[PDB]
Amino acid sequence: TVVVTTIMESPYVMYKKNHEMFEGNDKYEGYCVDLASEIAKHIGIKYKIAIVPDGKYGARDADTKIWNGMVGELVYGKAEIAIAPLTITLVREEVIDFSKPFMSLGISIMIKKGTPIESAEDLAKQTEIAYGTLDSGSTKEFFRRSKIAVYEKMWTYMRSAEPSVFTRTTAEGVARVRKSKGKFAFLLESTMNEYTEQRKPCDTMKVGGNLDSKGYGVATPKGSSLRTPVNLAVLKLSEAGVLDKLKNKWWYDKGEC
Amino acid sequence: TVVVTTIMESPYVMYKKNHEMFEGNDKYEGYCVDLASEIAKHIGIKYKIAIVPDGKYGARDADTKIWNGMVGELVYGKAEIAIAPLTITLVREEVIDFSKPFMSLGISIMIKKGTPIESAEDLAKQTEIAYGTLDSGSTKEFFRRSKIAVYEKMWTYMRSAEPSVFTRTTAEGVARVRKSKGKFAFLLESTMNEYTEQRKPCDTMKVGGNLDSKGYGVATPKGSSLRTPVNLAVLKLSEAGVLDKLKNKWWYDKGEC
Numbered sequence: 001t002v003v004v005t006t007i008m009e010s011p012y013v014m015y016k017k018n019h020e021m022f023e024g025n026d027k028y029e030g031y032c033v034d035l036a037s038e039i040a041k042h043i044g045i046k047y048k049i050a051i052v053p054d055g056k057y058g059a060r061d062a063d064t065k066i067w068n069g070m071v072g073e074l075v076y077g078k079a080e081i082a083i084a085p086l087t088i089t090l091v092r093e094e095v096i097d098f099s100k101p102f103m104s105l106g107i108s109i110m111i112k113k114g115t116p117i118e119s120a121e122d123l124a125k126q127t128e129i130a131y132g133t134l135d136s137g138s139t140k141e142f143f144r145r146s147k148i149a150v151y152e153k154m155w156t157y158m159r160s161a162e163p164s165v166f167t168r169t170t171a172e173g174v175a176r177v178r179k180s181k182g183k184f185a186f187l188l189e190s191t192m193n194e195y196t197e198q199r200k201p202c203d204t205m206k207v208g209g210n211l212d213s214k215g216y217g218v219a220t221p222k223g224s225s226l227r228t229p230v231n232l233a234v235l236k237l238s239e240a241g242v243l244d245k246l247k248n249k250w251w252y253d254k255g256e257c
Numbered sequence: 258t259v260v261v262t263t264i265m266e267s268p269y270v271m272y273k274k275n276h277e278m279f280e281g282n283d284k285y286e287g288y289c290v291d292l293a294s295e296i297a298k299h300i301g302i303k304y305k306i307a308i309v310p311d312g313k314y315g316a317r318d319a320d321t322k323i324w325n326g327m328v329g330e331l332v333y334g335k336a337e338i339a340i341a342p343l344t345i346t347l348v349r350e351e352v353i354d355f356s357k358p359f360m361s362l363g364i365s366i367m368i369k370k371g372t373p374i375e376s377a378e379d380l381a382k383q384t385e386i387a388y389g390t391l392d393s394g395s396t397k398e399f400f401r402r403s404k405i406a407v408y409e410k411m412w413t414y415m416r417s418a419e420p421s422v423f424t425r426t427t428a429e430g431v432a433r434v435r436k437s438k439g440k441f442a443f444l445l446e447s448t449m450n451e452y453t454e455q456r457k458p459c460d461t462m463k464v465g466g467n468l469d470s471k472g473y474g475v476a477t478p479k480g481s482s483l484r485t486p487v488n489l490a491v492l493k494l495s496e497a498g499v500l501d502k503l504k505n506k507w508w509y510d511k512g513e514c
């Protein structure tokens with residue numbers, strides 16, 4: 001039985017209603033739950049969903065050199081596959097493998113409706129509206145590593161902001177936007193942004209274009225015999241239109257706005 | 258010296274003005290010429306651009322089973338890398354390797370301006386306006402393999418249309434749209450469509466959403482020592498913003514409409 005690391009992140013992996021009465025995999029639902037079932041069926045594996053203990057995507061500590069999050073679970077042999085909105089990045093590709101993308105996305109801006117912001121440049125040239133991002137993820141790294149003036153300016157502000165503008169979870173970031181009367185904006189992936197825009201109370205909005213262009217991949221540890229089967233499975237699911245059906249199912253068919 | 262297979266396709270690879278006075282690689286310009294230069298610089302190779310002799314992207318003949326086009330050049334060892342708008346597909350992944358995507362795209366519809374068509378459904382529901390696609394590529398295979406009702410209907414029409422609606426080159430398809438007074442539409446990748454929309458005589462238009470979501474990758478033959486270096490170089494260029502800069506350079510900075 002293959003251990004699948006994943007993360008509680010709507011609408012990828014969520015608790016069922018009355019999840020406490022279900023056992024194992026049956027506790028959970030969502031895009032990545034369905035994707036896990038689809039891949040497992042295609043490659044012929046039994047699997048067990050294990051929610052990442054630390055609740056993180058995956059970053060490397062500069063001192064200890066230790067990987068945390070889902071990336072860590074793969075690197076240290078605690079999971080055999082990651083099926084999650086895990087961004088394909090250079091630093092991760094050096095330690096784990098990724099399938100070709102199952103979803104395409106870019107970093108984006110979430111505002112409380114009515115906030116006078118439509119671009120990164122708009123955020124960077126002002127201080128009346130605070131902004132932040134998820135901790136320990138690819139978005140934070142994007143800003144830390146950027147050599148583009150506008151993003152450098154945003155990083156310089158965010159890294160020194162007090163109280164901290166980096167959140168433990170996406171939901172925390174969203175909640176912060178919603179309660180801050182337009183005075184906090186959140187930098188997050190277009191996928192999560194567009195999902196939240198269709199959820200009650202319908203008070204948030206994606207503004208401007210995406211900051212970058214990238215993808216999520218299904219990840220495996222180096223040397224895994226699952227690498228090629230997984231890659232081919234993702235491509236088959238893409239070409240068969242199943243990935244499109246799954247996105248429509250979890251984003252738009254269930255839309256509330 | 259690494260042999261780089263590529264294809265004459267605007268704005269990826271084009272002849273310089275007065276190409277005839279230049280030698281070797283310096284005869285060419287375009288997005289993929291710049292990409293090859295960037296990749297070679299990162300991985301430390303010398304290279305020679307070789308335009309694919311048959312002028313095809315690459316398909317497997319059902320009878321003889323032989324790969325043609327750029328895919329063929331790699332499979333039979335006539336080239337060491339493909340740097341071109343080559344779509345990452347399942348059937349190709351079975352015979353060659355691809356980097357993670359350097360460009361994201363989907364199939365789209367090109368019309369002559371004023372054509373009463375806004376969607377694939379619009380095309381499938383009528384017979385007055387003919388429509389087709391490129392030979393030996395991923396768009397043709399998309400329609401052949403689709404089980405989506407609308408696309409099945411389009412395939413059934415296109416495969417048996419007289420005169421032929423399939424073209425040998427993208428340029429042929431585009432010329433046919435421009436010359437056919439609204440009575441021909443062309444199915445091609447969003448990237449090519451968007452480029453053409455910004456070129457004189459500014460008489461074409463992309464209509465409707467993309468039919469799928471996929472990527473172009475830099476391709477290498479199985480067992481190539483260049484596989485990993487190429488993959489990391491593409492991700493490095495992505496993360497540094499170079500891919501975005503090159504798209505802007507070749508699509509929009511050079512817009513004519």
Ligand SMILES: N[C@@H](CCC(=O)O)C(=O)O
Pocket residue numbers: 057058085086087088134136137138139140187188189
């Ligand atoms: N998908 C991101 C997490 C979300 C974010 O950083 O915006 C990652 O893999 O790290």
Ligand SMILES: N[C@@H](CCC(=O)O)C(=O)O
Pocket residue numbers: 314315342343344391393394395396397444445446
């Ligand atoms: N990029 C496609 C060719 C263009 C098309 O098929 O529309 C391929 O690699 O086959």
